[PDB]
Amino acid sequence: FEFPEELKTKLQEHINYFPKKRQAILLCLHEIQNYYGYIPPESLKPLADMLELPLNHVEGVVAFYDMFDREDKAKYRIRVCVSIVCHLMGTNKLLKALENILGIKPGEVTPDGKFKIVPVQCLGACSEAPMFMVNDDEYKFESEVQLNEILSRYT
């Protein structure tokens, strides 16, 4: 497999960053996930090469870390917290609003493939519970109407 040059360039950016190349795997994997909208399986053989690690090593990593997804491609990952505080403040109300607007449950992807809901543990924002992240952007859930408007920004 061959990476696009711009993406190749950044991956390689990350490898030169730390003293040892192998330390840049998570950063590189993040770039790949961010670019492709998921972690392609075919992308791994190439990356191990640049990492100067075995393919197995890289695949053990991808499986281990929950932020990387190798099965489903989504433009925008709606990370919805499911931990205690958020649950007390009203994760359910949030899930409901997401179902109504996007017509999908957690773990599911819209037919568009643009929005995927991912249930996650505490996002480090418990006072602003219920919490959700649209990709790198993080917001508090207030109401269905409010949610629509935010989601509207993700096209």
Binding site: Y17, F18, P19, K20, R22, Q23, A24, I25, L26, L27, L29, H30, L51, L53, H57, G60, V61, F64, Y65, D66, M67, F68, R79, V82, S83, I84, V85, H87, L88, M89, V120, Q121, C122, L123, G124, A125, C126, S127, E128, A129, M131, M133, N135, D136, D137, E138, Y139, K140
Partner: protein
């Protein structure tokens, strides 16, 4: 341009850690310098490393990652082993209810960076890392930008301020494993491996990153370092009780009118946090319980305890989740059990199976589908997650839930 981050409320009576960070925006190096930023770094470099350790040791500063280990002593340990040595700032902060560290990172990165450079110099570490969770993207970008500023102003690089000391701070990111918060697992992650905790001892200070003395410290702990140098160890000790002196950030969440981080002295009681500072409960309800993160559970009869690291103290990371009378205890435990099910790394069998079975059996109890043996099985599993485990997740995986059964037997009985 940084990603959207919620404006978590911040309030302080000490006006140290939250001096700038009480305002929910990025404070840049100019704004930091205007407030006497980097003065402490400059004072530090004129002192010898050993003197800094003495100051931090005499400061009585303890770890803010929950274990409450004395920072000064930890530093002495690293330095007895030959170099090279490494310095890691632990910014993984994935524990439920705990959002104290990010507000420093996001709002006052330079306080952290100043603390890191001083800390690095104390232990003679010429390489320094920040491991920030991957779910804090704005923190990562804010820190990267801040490092550049300090570097451009000469706070980072070779021969910093003609001191002769060379430092680079590298920013690593996690990818969703709570376990990477444990120092040895963090080190494995920094080595490009999976986050599997190493058997201790050896401790990181003896053997750590690339088998070299490594000091791992929490974001909050490092943030105190500038104040200690700036004020002096004696002045610092006068903050709060001598017993447990210095500013402590308290992340308060759940059923309160005013949820956020509160900078307070450690003689503050848990009642004052909730009622004095946090505004009391939503709807003026009776407090049923406080969950100290995923670690401890406190009943309403234990509210008059100091927010310190004493045996009778609240302890931990000071994380305060308040549950009111309406909130179902069993339902809360389910979420807590769910948390350890997801975050167990699986290296140890009691931990691996225990976390799963606790979560799975507890779900059966809550849904009303639990057989007689499921009940007896759940009780056993909860008391046998800890055996043979090599890190603290497995030890504490059953700790809170146990306390619910003990302190709230009546509500549990209903589920039978």
């Amino acid at each position: 341009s940084y990603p959207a981050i919620p404006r978590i409320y911040a309030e302080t009576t000490l006006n140290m850690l939250l001096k700038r960070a009480k305002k929910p925006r990025v404070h840049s190096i100019d704004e930091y310098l205007k407030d006497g930023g980097y003065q402490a770094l400059e004072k530090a470099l004129n002192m010898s490393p050993e003197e800094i350790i003495d100051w931090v040791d005499k400061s009585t500063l303890r770890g803010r990652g929950g274990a409450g280990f004395p920072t000064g002593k930890k530093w002495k340990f690293a330095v007895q082993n030959p170099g090279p040595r490494y310095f890691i700032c632990n910014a993984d902060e994935s524990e439920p209810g705990t959002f104290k560290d990010r507000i420093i990172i996001e709002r006052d990165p330079h306080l952290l960076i100043e603390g890191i450079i001083i800390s690095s110099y104390a232990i003679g570490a010429n390489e320094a890392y920040i491991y920030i969770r991957g779910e804090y993207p704005a923190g990562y970008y804010i820190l990267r930008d801040a490092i550049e500023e300090a570097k451009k102003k000469g706070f980072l690089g070779k021969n910093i301020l003609g001191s002769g000391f060379d430092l680079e701070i590298y920013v690593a990111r996690g990818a969703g494993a709570y376990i990477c918060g444990e120092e040895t697992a963090l080190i494995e992650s920094l080595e490009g491996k999976r986050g599997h905790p190493r058997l201790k001892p050896p401790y990181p200070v003896q053997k750590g990153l690339w088998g070299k003395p490594t000091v791992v410290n929490n974001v909050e702990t490092i943030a105190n370092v500038p104040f200690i140098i700036s004020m002096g160890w004696e002045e610092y000790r006068y903050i709060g009780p001598s017993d447990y002196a210095g500013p402590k950030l308290f992340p308060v969440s759940g059923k309160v009118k005013k949820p956020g981080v509160y900078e307070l002295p450690m003689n503050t009681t848990l009642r004052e946090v909730i009622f004095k500072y946090a505004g009391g409960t939503l709807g003026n309800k009776k407090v049923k319980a406080v969950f100290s993160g995923a670690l401890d559970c406190f009943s309403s009869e234990e509210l008059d305890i100091p927010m310190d690291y004493s045996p009778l103290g609240f302890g931990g990371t000071g994380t305060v989740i308040v549950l009111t009378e309406e909130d179902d205890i069993v339902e809360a435990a389910l979420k807590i059990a769910e948390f350890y099910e997801h975050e167990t790394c699986g290296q140890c069998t009691p931990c691996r199976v225990g976390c799963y079975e606790q979560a799975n059996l507890l779900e059966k109890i809550y849904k009303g589908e639990a057989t007689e043996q499921d009940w007896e099985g759940f009780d056993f599993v909860n008391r046998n997650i800890q055996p043979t485990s090599i890190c603290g997740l497995g030890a504490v995986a059953g700790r809170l839930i146990r306390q619910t059964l003990e302190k709230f037997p009546e509500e549990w009985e209903k589920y039978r």
